[PDB]
Here is the input.
Amino acid sequence: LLGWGLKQAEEANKTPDKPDKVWRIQAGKGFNEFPNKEYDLYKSLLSSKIDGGWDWGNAATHYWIKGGQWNKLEVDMKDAVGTYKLSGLRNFTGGDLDVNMQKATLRLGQFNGNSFTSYKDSADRTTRVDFNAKNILIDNFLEINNRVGSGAGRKASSTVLTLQASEGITSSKNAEISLYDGATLNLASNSVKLNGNVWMGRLQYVGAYLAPSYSTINTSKVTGEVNFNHLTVGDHNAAQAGIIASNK
Amino acid sequence: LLGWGLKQAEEANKTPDKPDKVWRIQAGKGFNEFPNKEYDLYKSLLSSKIDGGWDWGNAATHYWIKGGQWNKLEVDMKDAVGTYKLSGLRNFTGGDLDVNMQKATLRLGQFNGNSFTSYKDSADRTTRVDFNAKNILIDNFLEINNRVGSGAGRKASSTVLTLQASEGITSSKNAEISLYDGATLNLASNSVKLNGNVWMGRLQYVGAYLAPSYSTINTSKVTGEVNFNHLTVGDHNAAQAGIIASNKTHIGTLDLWQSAGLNIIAPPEGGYKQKTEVQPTQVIDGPFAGGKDTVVNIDRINTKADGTIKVGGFKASLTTNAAHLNIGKGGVNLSNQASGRTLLVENLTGNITVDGPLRVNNQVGGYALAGSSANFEFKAGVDTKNGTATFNNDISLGRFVNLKVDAHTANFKGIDTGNGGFNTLDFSGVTNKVNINKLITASTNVAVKNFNINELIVKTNGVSVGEYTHFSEDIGSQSRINTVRLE
Amino acid sequence: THIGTLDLWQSAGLNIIAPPEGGYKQKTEVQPTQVIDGPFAGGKDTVVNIDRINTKADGTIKVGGFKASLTTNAAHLNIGKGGVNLSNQASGRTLLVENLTGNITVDGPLRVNNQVGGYALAGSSANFEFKAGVDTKNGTATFNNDISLGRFVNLKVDAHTANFKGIDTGNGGFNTLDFSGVTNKVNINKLITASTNVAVKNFNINELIVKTNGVSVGEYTHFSEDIGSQSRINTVRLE
Here is the structure.
C-alpha cells in the first residue's frame, strides 16, 4: 500500500540509534601474526560480550548484546591477520555490531547458518550489523530479519546488514541468502558473485499471505562485476523488491 | 562454555570498585622500633575496623569491613618493623583491603587458616585484597573465594588476591592454597616457592559437578625462580585453570582431573609492556607465541580418574605456549576407568622433550581392556609447524593404548608395543620425519608418511589372525628402515 | 491371554495379573475404605501364552544393566516358538521373566541380538533370569527347547525343579550358569561347557561334555558350590 519507493527512500536516510552502554573490544596481541590459523570469531572473541538466552515464547536460541537489545558494541582489530568464522549465530536480535577487520578474511557460515533479526519494541529499532573484512566468503546460509521461532512472542522489526569487503564478496553453492520484510543489505566490495539462492521476500509468518514484504539489496558501491546466479523474489505474497545496482 | 581465555582477559582489565567510606588507618608510633616482637595483626590493629558477625543461613563466622561489604579500608605503615600474622580470618567477605607493610615480615597463617570470599550481590563486586610485605611465609592454608558455609544463603562472586613481597613468597609443607571458581592470585616478589598443595579449582558447592570453575595464578612480575611443588587442578568438574608465568616454571607433581585443563602461558618476546556512555577499551588476548628462553619444567603428570562413564574419554589436557616443555624423569601416569582416558599434552609454539616412562595406572606396561582405549596425545609446535617432539626415554605401551604425535620431527629412542597389541600408533600430523630408533610391534595401526626406523621387529601374536602390523597410510618416497628382523 | 510380539524397553516392567481362584467378587471427615491388593496367587487354569519377547535396547550406559522384567502370577506362563530376544548395548542387558505362583514353560531359542549364538563382550554380561514359583516354592521351569548360550551370557534359574533338554555354552565361555535358587533338582539332558560357572546343589545331568578352550588357562568348568548327596551324571565324555 505504501510502495517500495517510499520505504527505501525513508530508510536510507536515518540516524542509526541512540544506544547506551557502547561496549568497545579491541583484539590485542595474539591474533595479528598467525596468517593461516582459522580462528573462531564468536567463541574466541565475541562471546565475551554477546550472551545467549531463551525467550519464553517460540525460542530456539536467543542472542542480544548485553542486558537487552539496545546496547552497541564494536570490535576494532585493524591488523588481525588470519581467517575468521561465525558458524552458528542464530536468531541474533542484538543491535549495532561493527566488526572492523582490515586484512582479515571472513567466513560467515560453516556447518550452521546465521541470522540477524530485531524486535518490534516501542522504540522501533534497527540492527545496523556491519562488517569490514577483506574477503567475506559467505559459504552457508544467512537469514536477514527472519522469524525468531514460530509466530508468537515478539514480532520482528527492520534491520540493516552491511558487508564492506575490499577484495570480493563471493558465496558457495548452497548459501541461501534470504532477506525478509524489513531487511536491507549494503555491499561495498568489488565483484560480488553470489552463486546461491538469493531470496528477496519470504513468508515471514505461517499464514500471512497478505504481508507487504519489501526488501533491498543496495549494491551501490560495487566497483567491479556484480554477478548473481539465482534470484528469487516473493513467496505467496505481493513482494516488491528493489536492487539499487552499480550499472552492470 | 566461555573458556578461560575470555574470563581472565576480561577480569584483568577492570576498575576496582566504587566504595563509599574509604577508611584510613595509619600505624603510628609503638610499632616501628621492635624488630622481633611477633605482633598480631588482626587483634592488635585490624580488629578496630573489621567487625565479625553471623549470617542467618550457613554461617561459621562472618567478616566484613564496616557497615556492609562495600567499604574500603587501607593500612599505611611503611616503616613498621617486626613480624605480623593473621591467624584465623575465616570467611572474610569484606572488600578492598591493602595492608601496605614495607620492611615487615608477614605470616599469613598460624594455628588456623584464612579465607577471602565475596558475595554475589546486585553490583557483582570483587574483593581486591592486597598486601605489600617483605617476606610473606604463608605457613598455613588459605582458601581464596571459598564456600562460606554449606550451599545456601548468599552465593560467592569473584575475588582478587595480590601478594606483593620483595624478598620471597615461600610456604610451609601443610599450607593448602585452594583457590576456586572466581579466584585469582597475583604475585610480584622474587622466587616464589610454594612447597604445599596448590589446588586450582575445587567443588565450590556440595553437588554441582557441572560448574565451570576457572582460576588464575598470575605470577607475572616474578623476577626470580618460580617453584611449585604440588599442583592439583580440578576436582569432579571440568576445571580450566591458567598460570601466566614468568618464563621459568619448575613445578613438581601435577595432578590433573579427568576433564581438567591447564593454560600455562609464557610471556611474549619483549615481555609485557537516554544517554550514551563509553565503556573503556577491553583489550583482549589471543594465543600468542612465547619468548625464546621460556621453559616449563613440569616433572610429573598424574591423573585422578574415577567417577561416571561417558561415551568417550574425558580428555585431560594442558596447554603451553612456551618455547620448551621439558618433562623430566617422573614421566607420565594416567589412571583409567572403564572408558579410555585421554591425555592431551599440547604445545602451541614450542617443543616437547619428554624424558620419562609413559605409564598408565602407574605401571610401565599397563594393559587396558577394549572399551578402555587410553589415548596419549602430543602436539608439538602447532601454530608454527616446526616443533619437534623428542622422547629421549624408551617408551613402552601395552594393550589398547593409543599414542598420537602431531609434530614436525618426532624423534624417539624406542617404541615397544608388541607386548599388548591393538595399539593405534598414530603419526598422521607429522610434517616430515619420525626418527624411531627401535620398534617392537604385534598388532599395531602405525600410520607414518615418512620415516627412517633403523631397527624393526616383526612379532607374532599367538594363534589368532586379523592382528598384524598395518602401515595404514602412504609411506611416500624418502622412507627407510635400516634393519628388519622377523621372529 | 494369548498375545503376540511383546517388545519391552530396557527398564520396562509388566504386571500381568490373573484373577484369583473364585474370580473377583474444624471437623473430622471419614474417607472411604481404600481396599488395597497384595501379590496373590492366580486360579488353577490361568494361562498367559506370550509367544515372543523382544527388547529395544539403545541409549545411555549405566553402572549395571537396566533389568527389563515382566511379572506374572498365573499358574502357567507358556512362551511359544518365537523364543526370547535381547538387544545388547555396551553394558549387559538383563531380562527378568518372573513368575510368582506358577510355572514357566519356555519352548523357544534364547537369542541375543537376534541370533542363537550371540557373542557378547566382557562389559556386556547379558543376564537371562527366570523365577518359577517364587512365593509357593513348588514351580518348575521347564525349557523344552535346546538352548544355546554364547559368550558372556548369564542364565540363572531360581525354581523348584528346573527341567531342561540341553544347554550348550562351550562355544562362548565365561558364562555364569547359576542355579542357586533351585530347591532340589536340575534335570539337564545334555551339557556343553568350556569355561562356565555352574552352581547346582543337586542334579542328574545324564550327558556331559568336557571341552577345551584354546591354549589359555584359568578357564574351566567350575562347580563353584556344594554338589550334595543325590547328585548323578550318567555320561561324562572328555574331548
The first helix of chain A runs from residue 4 to 11. Chain A is about 5% helix and 15% strand. Chains A and C do not touch (no CB pair under 8 Å).
